[PDB]
Design a binder for this molecule. Structure first.
Ligand SMILES: NC(=O)c1ccc[n+]([C@@H]2O[C@H](COP(=O)([O-])OP(=O)(O)OC[C@H]3O[C@@H](n4cnc5c(N)ncnc54)[C@H](OP(=O)(O)O)[C@@H]3O)[C@@H](O)[C@H]2O)c1
Ligand SMILES: *OP(=O)(O)OCC(C)(C)[C@@H](O)C(=O)NCCC(=O)NCCSC(=O)CC(C)=O
Lengths: 163, 97, 871, 179, 212
């Protein structure tokens, strides 16, 4: 289908959501990082460090700037490649949750064959997979493909695509 | 300064195997691919910041930091003692700050 | 202890805690106190019984420390948030009451820098400043037809051009101009001028998304992608015709055991299978279609592809996105030629621009077409075309029919002539492997001194391809990349000359080109002068059975006889030589007087109608022979005083020419491949040269190992080194070897060599040595002297005329450069020669034919009235 | 987190002080001539200490050549590098056979947290007022403070003179322990 | 639009007629070649005769924008658009043009983010002091020709529809008829804004029979 690089607005969302251990819809864009953390500067500084690692540069006041205004500030200098933080988080998701034999490349294959999603939109589905991390490792291959299906539908809903 | 030397080595103080291997390497002969040294001081200042972790929140990162900052300092001093004792070095104690 | 990992979060309250008379330490103070425990007294105390050192500063005596901490942090956050909220409210009250017209006279306008890329022509001092540095006697003493100058230079290599590479080499980061030039080179930005989403835009735009890009926003948006895709890096298969060193395709010959299932193939292809295999194949016509059934039988040879993992994964590749189209080369040229030819054409037009020559035919206003040489060469030439004709042709692939002619080393120089220069000058193509470029300069010099040419393009070029990469690994010349990974090294730090751990060279690709000419012609034309090529020499080594082994031949350039050195020879002393020249200038004058008298006596016997002709001819002949005799004396006492003298080294005399001592050779641009044999042998050669010529103890030459950044490009290596030497001469900045982690202990024995790891901004460099040590015993050296030494040999008026012509040409060059950059037309192929095919013979055979501006087409060409004319 | 990081092959040795001494000197020389370092900077005294700690016969001859060929008539800066150079040559001859010494001469710093009118919190390391040497810091530490109780130099005026004083082991009349 | 007009046969109108017969009556595929071949003649005529002189003219010498410095351009924009007699900018949109240009000069020649020295264009009501002030901060721009990106910007500013057309020809291209013939009528009432204050440049509408 049409290949799109992941938007900074989705990457930023997923990184915050995963760090706070909350769903993407539970995190509203309107609110600032400092509001969301809830007076815990440690977690604030952990998010800032992860965004600084991922996007390279940060704005001057990232604490008081709302998430939609950070996502727009990053998009000006954001390419579309995942980076050093997203890549490591996905590797830790896949290793820790997929059954012994299922690697990242098998997920990328399954998304290219079953759904036909190219590498740019695979990266997006994998980020939606990260945001809704399951509790315990998926026992079999069939419920692991059923999870990747549920994340493709979620990715397609949020971005606005038909599968 | 003159006569100084700086050896930089990758090292995880958290790993027991890195601790044992680093001390073997410092004490091993130059022939066997080590340094052929015998330490006069150890300054084990590794540490990770644990921040906003109360008693109820003590979990993996704390149990790991405690391994770095205590358990593997004791294991390092152990290793240095076992290397000095194997070579009969009874007159050159290594100062641990 | 303030500002550590563990305590940086508490810095804001540290001033508060000190108000309880607690002492908080800086990391320096706390280290000082801890180093006090390692003193012999405390060590002796520790050996008796354990020591407990309180370095608290009274922190233990703070009662309820967390309560005091929590208070101080709350009070500081509160004060912050109050003053921010009150300030915002007071600014909204002042804005409503007085309106939005009050903070429009208070608001100011912000100017963001646009990238203004400069051609960095040499800075010309006033005639009073340049007259001080040269000796007073140098004026009139040199023959300037026999002084070689570099008027222009350029490169195409892993860091882009010579402008970008120099920025990375010297500073280690790009400026705004650097970034924009790399962004343009790598095709990340194009220039747009016209309607863009209705709104009219004139500037840079992203090249894929056509979105506007401000010059300030380039670094933020592209620096990371420009650095990740430049310099020494993992081999990118897209750049090398799908070549992946992880999966390197070979073919195993197997004997077929069981008859393969017939396949359908054309009648021609089936007869070709039958000729090859003989009775081990059965070809049968299919009557239905007329195709043939080809069945391989038991025992037929077959070839099955297998892949090998190769261990050389890293190379100095030209930045990803580089495209000759970006520079203006057309698709018909790109299709036809081998990509090494494209690096050359770009380097040649970019070197003419640095010379301030936008139209090569301009040169034919000042010299005959037979006086513009191409003395430049390669190590292995068009290896893409060789791969075409040895391997791709074998596999019955589609290859062009003229692929042979693209492989020749001498073919790149031909395309420069056939597309840009259209000269009939000399064409001497050296093949020196890693020394090629220095052998090029030496030939280009000897060509210009012999008078066969007055301008040479010189330099070198080489490509990287699969086959070379492999065979350099089989010889173990190149670094094993898997071993470097085992040792922690990233790609950037794999090329590390003069280092303990150096273990083979990084292969690179690219071209470097200099335009050299006589100084007398450069001053006439008003081109910029970057340096004087004082000396250039090649040398073989000796008997031996190792072709790759470097040796000490080039030491011969410092060959000097020290049996009888009690009393200083007059010949080295410039006053003596100037006195003998003035003595001979007086005799040449008396010879012109005596020839004019003898012409007056001979003109009387000629009738009074033919007298005018005869006196014109014979006066011109006298003027010639007077200039010939003056220049021969200038040469004999200014340029060539030391050729016959066994007591003056070629290297000492080159410097002495311009009144420099051996101590005034400040920098040595070492070959410095990062091999064990090369870097020791080179240090040892330079050290022994300098020791023999009596270089003052405590004055080492400052080594410069440019190949830490670029990698070794073979052919091009010395061309790059020269370009760097010229950039050092004109800037005074000596780049350091940022990969020299630890200089090899063996190299301490060489007192006359210093190996810096960081950039020194000196107060000036007077001369630079360049050394190269090719495979096959090609040693080579060139000395290059700061161009301000030349300006002491000319008068104030001639200097000032020069300075005015160069200023004018630097402005036209800036114009041409920026217009070409944005409209992708720096390179403009010539359609036609400067002469029609009817004048071709007439121009070749008249040595005073010059081009002039054709009034209709506005383009320099030969006019039949300026050919075998009287004027 | 217990993943192995250590390998013997990854050890990087740094032992080439003989090269860096000469580079340190040449850097200082040119930084003075260009005016990046001034006669009132503690960076000149720090570089002097670090050069003296790498003194050998090769480094002395290197200084003798560069300093003795410096024209003291090209500028104030060239006169300053000539004067400082001749003093650093004397110091480097005196401490040729002496063991090298840890000797910090950096300005001691205290914490300073400021809130501006707009409410932005900025932490800096501001120089202390009483303590400007380490000798003065050792005195401050010896006296202690109220919470603990039970019941002449040329720094920042003439870097050349402070350099001249470097090799001379000051005799401590009475120790800080008596106070 | 090719509609006939009765104008007094001044030198500028007789040049307008010459160009209507030999340049503007040509098809578009043969217009640009003829403008490149006649260039030198055309510019000599515009400078001597017409009310819109060739912009790129530095003290009598016929240059091109490519071969003018940024000082040269600025001092020509003041010479053509600012009226010494009334000591004011003939149109405000001309002062904006000249300010926009002087800000571009700063953008091109500055090394870092700085404050514009032209804060409000209201400062250009002393144009010689504003110019000196800009070309003293950035004296490199006194000696460099126009960057080709600044030529394209300058010509893009010359075609702005929301300003009084520039009182000069900045280039010979496909748009030379529009440069030459646009806004040709105000000049006869405002000779203080014409080159030599010479009526003979201008276009004055008048009837042949009513002229009696
Ligand atoms: N029948 C007759 O005898 C007769 C005689 C004389 C004139 N006319 C007519 O009068 C009309 C205009 O006269 P013209 O000969 O001068 O033709 P013109 O050159 O096409 O018109 C003048 C143009 O200048 C622009 N302009 C001038 N000052 C401006 C400012 N301060 N701000 C914005 N734009 C400005 C306008 O552009 P924009 O419109 O794009 O803003 C306008 O279209 C024509 O249609 C013509 O036919 C007729
Ligand atoms: O989010 P924040 O408000 O910027 O951080 C608040 C604090 C400081 C409370 C947070 O980082 C935290 O919980 N830190 C841990 C407490 C602490 O600071 N411990 C210090 C460990 S180091 C140490 O104690 C050195 C010493 C004096 O021996």
């Amino acid at each position: 289908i049409a290949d799109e690089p992941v938007k900074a607005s989705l990457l930023l969302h997923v990184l915050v959501a995963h760090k706070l251990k909350k769903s993407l819809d539970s995190i509203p864009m309107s609110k600032t990082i400092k509001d969301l953390v809830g007076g815990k500067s440690t977690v604030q500084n952990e998010i800032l460090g992860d965004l600084g690692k991922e996007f390279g540069t940060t704005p001057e006041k990232p604490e008081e700037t709302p998430l939609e205004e950070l996502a727009e500030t990053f998009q000006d200098t954001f390419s579309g490649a995942l980076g050093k933080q997203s890549s490591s988080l996905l590797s830790r998701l896949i290793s820790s949750k997929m059954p012994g034999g299922f690697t990242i490349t098998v997920a990328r294959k399954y998304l290219q064959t079953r759904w036909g999603l190219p590498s740019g939109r695979q990266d997006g589905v994998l980020l939606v997979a990260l945001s809704n991390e399951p509790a315990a490792r998926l026992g079999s291959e069939a419920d692991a493909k059923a999870f990747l299906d549920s994340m493709a539908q979620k990715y397609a809903s949020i971005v606005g695509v038909d599968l | 300064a003159k006569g100084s030397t700086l050896i930089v080595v990758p090292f995880n103080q958290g790993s027991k195997q890195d601790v044992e291997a680093l001390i073997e390497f410092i004490y091993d002969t130059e022939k066997n691919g080590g340094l052929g040294w015998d330490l006069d001081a150890i300054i084990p200042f590794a540490a990770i910041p644990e921040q906003g972790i109360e008693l109820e929140h003590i979990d993996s990162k704390s149990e790991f930091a405690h391994r770095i900052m205590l358990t593997n300092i004791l294991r390092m001093m152990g290793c240095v003692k076992k290397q000095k004792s194997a070579r009969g070095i009874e007159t050159r104690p290594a100062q641990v700050i | 202890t303030r500002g550590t990992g563990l305590m940086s979060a508490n810095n804001i309250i540290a001033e508060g805690i000190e108000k309880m008379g607690v002492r908080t330490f800086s990391q320096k103070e706390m280290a000082f106190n801890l180093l006090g425990l390692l003193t012999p007294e405390v060590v002796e105390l520790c050996q008796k019984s354990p020591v407990m050192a309180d370095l608290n500063g009274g922190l233990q005596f703070v009662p309820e420390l967390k309560e005091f901490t929590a208070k101080l942090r709350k009070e500081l956050v509160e004060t912050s948030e109050v003053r921010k909220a009150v300030s915002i409210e007071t600014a909204l009250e002042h804005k409503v009451v007085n309106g939005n017209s009050a903070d429009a006279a208070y608001a100011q306008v912000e100017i963001q820098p646009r990238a203004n890329i400069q051609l960095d022509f040499p800075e010309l001092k006033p005639y009073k400043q340049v007259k001080q540095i040269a000796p007073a006697e140098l004026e009139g003493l040199l023959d300037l037809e026999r002084v070689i100058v570099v008027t222009g230079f350029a490169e195409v290599g892993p860091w882009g051009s010579a402008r970008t590479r120099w920025e990375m080499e010297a500073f280690g980061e790009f400026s705004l101009e650097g970034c924009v030039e790399m962004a343009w080179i790598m095709g990340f930005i194009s220039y747009h001028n016209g309607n863009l989403k209705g709104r009219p835009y004139t500037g840079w735009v992203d090249s894929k998304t056509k979105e506007p890009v401000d010059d300030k926003d380039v670094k933020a948006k592209y620096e990371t992608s420009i650095l990740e895709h430049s310099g020494i890096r993992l081999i990118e298969p897209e750049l090398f015709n799908g070549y992946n060193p992880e999966k390197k395709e070979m073919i195993q010959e197997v004997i077929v055991e069981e008859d393969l299932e017939p396949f359908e193939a054309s009648k021609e292809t089936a007869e070709q299978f039958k000729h090859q295999h003989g009775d081990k194949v059965d070809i049968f016509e299919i009557p239905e279609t007329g195709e043939y059934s080809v069945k391989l039988l038991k025992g037929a040879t077959l070839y099955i592809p297998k892949a090998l993992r190769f261990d050389r994964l890293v190379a100095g590749q030209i930045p990803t996105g580089w495209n000759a189209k970006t520079y203006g080369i057309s698709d018909d040229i790109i299709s036809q030629v081998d990509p090494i030819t494209l690096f050359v054409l770009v380097s040649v037009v970019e070197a003419f621009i640095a010379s301030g020559i936008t139209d090569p035919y301009e040169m034919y206003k000042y010299v005959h077409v037979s006086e513009v040489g191409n003395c430049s060469g390669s190590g292995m030439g068009g290896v893409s075309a060789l791969r075409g004709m040895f391997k791709d042709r074998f596999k019955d692939e589609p290859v062009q029919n003229d692929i042979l002619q693209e492989s020749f080393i001498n073919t790149m120089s031909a395309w420069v002539n056939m597309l840009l220069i259209s000269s009939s000058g000399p064409i001497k193509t050296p093949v020196g492997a890693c020394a090629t470029s220095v052998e090029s300069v030496d030939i280009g010099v000897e060509t210009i001194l012999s008078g066969k040419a007055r301008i040479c393009i010189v330099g070198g070029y080489d490509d990287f391809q699969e086959e070379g990469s492999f065979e350099f690994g089989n010889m173990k010349a190149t670094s094993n990349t898997l071993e470097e990974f085992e040792h922690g090294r990233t790609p950037a730090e794999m090329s590390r000359p003069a280092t303990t751990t150096r273990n083979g060279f990084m292969e690179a690709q690219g071209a470097g080109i200099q335009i050299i000419m006589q100084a007398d012609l450069a001053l006439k034309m008003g081109v910029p002068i970057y340096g004087i090529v004082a000396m250039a020499a090649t040398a073989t080594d000796k008997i031996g059975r190792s072709v790759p082994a470097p040796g000490k031949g080039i030491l011969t350039t410092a060959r000097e006889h020290h049996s009888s050195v009690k009393y200083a020879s007059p010949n080295l002393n410039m006053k003596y030589r100037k006195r003998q020249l003035v003595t001979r200038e007086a005799q040449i004058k008396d010879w012109v007087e005596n020839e004019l008298e003898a012409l007056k006596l001979e003109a009387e016997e000629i009738p009074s109608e033919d007298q005018n002709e005869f006196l014109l001819e014979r006066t011109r002949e006298i003027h010639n022979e007077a200039e010939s005799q003056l220049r021969a004396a200038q040469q004999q006492w200014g340029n060539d005083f030391y050729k016959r003298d066994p007591r003056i080294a070629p290297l000492r005399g080159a410097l002495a020419t311009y009144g420099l001592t051996i101590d005034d050779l400040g920098v040595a641009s070492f070959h410095g491949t990062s091999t064990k044999a090369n870097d020791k042998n080179e240090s040892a050669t330079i050290n022994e040269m300098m020791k023999h010529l009596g270089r003052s103890e405590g004055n080492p030459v400052i080594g410069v190992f440019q190949k830490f950044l670029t990698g070794h490009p073979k052919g091009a290596a010395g061309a790059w080194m020269m370009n760097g030497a010229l950039q050092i001469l004109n800037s005074g900045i000596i780049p350091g070897n940022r990969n020299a982690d630890n200089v090899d202990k063996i190299l301490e024995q060489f007192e006359y060599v210093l190996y810096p790891s960081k950039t020194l901004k000196t107060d000036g460099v007077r001369a630079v040595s360049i050394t190269s040590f090719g495979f096959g015993q090609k040693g080579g050296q060139a000395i290059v002297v700061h161009p301000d030494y030349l300006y002491g040999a000319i008068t104030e008026d001639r200097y000032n005329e020069y300075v005015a012509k160069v200023s004018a040409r630097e402005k036209s060059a800036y114009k041409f450069f920026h217009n070409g950059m944005i409209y992708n037309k720096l390179f403009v192929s010539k359609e036609h020669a400067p002469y029609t095919d009817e004048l071709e013979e007439d121009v070749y055979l008249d040595p005073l034919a010059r081009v002039s501006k054709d009034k209709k087409s506005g383009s320099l060409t030969f006019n039949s009235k300026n050919i075998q004319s009287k004027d | 987190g217990v993943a192995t990081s250590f390998s013997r092959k990854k050890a990087r040795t740094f032992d080439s002080s003989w090269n860096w001494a000469k580079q340190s000197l040449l850097s200082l020389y040119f930084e003075i001539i260009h005016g990046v370092l001034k006669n009132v900077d503690r960076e000149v005294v720090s570089e002097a200490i670090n050069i003296m700690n790498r003194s050998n016969d090769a480094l002395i001859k290197f200084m003798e050549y560069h300093i003795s060929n410096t024209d003291e008539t090209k500028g104030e800066n060239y006169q300053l590098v000539k004067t400082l150079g001749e003093q650093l040559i004397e110091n480097c001859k005196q401490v040729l056979d002496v063991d090298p010494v840890y000797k910090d001469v950096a300005k001691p710093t205290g914490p300073k947290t400021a809130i501006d009118k707009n409410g932005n919190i900025t932490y800096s390391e501001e120089p202390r007022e009483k303590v400007r040497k380490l000798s003065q810091y050792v005195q401050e530490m010896a006296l202690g403070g109220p919470i603990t109780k039970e019941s002449e130099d040329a720094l920042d005026k003439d870097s050349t003179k402070e350099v001249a004083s470097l090799p001379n082991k000051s005799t401590i009349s009475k120790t800080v322990s008596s106070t | 639009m090719g509609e006939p007009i009765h104008k007094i046969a001044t030198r500028g109108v007789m040049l307008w007629k010459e160009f209507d017969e030999t340049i503007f009556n040509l098809p578009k595929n043969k217009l640009v070649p003829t403008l490149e071949a006649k260039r030198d003649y055309i510019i000599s005529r515009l400078n001597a005769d017409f009310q819109k002189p060739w912009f790129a003219t530095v003290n009598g010498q016929a240059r091109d924008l490519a071969t003018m410095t940024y000082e040269e351009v600025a001092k020509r924009l003041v010479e053509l658009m600012f009226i010494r007699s009334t000591n004011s900018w003939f149109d405000v949109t001309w002062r904006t043009f000249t300010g926009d240009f002087l800000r571009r000069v700063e953008e091109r020649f500055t090394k870092s983010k700085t404050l514009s020295l032209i804060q409000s264009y209201s400062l250009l009501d002393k144009p010689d002091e504003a110019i000196e002030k800009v070309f003293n901060a950035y004296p490199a721009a006194r000696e460099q020709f126009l960057n080709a990106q600044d030529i394209d910007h300058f010509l893009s500013m010359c075609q702005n529809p929301m300003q009084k057309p520039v009182p000069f020809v900045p280039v010979l291209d496909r748009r030379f008829e529009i440069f030459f013939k646009k806004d040709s009528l105000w000049q006869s009432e405002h000779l203080e804004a014409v080159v030599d204050q010479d009526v003979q440049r201008t276009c004055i509408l008048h009837g042949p029979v009513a002229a009696q």
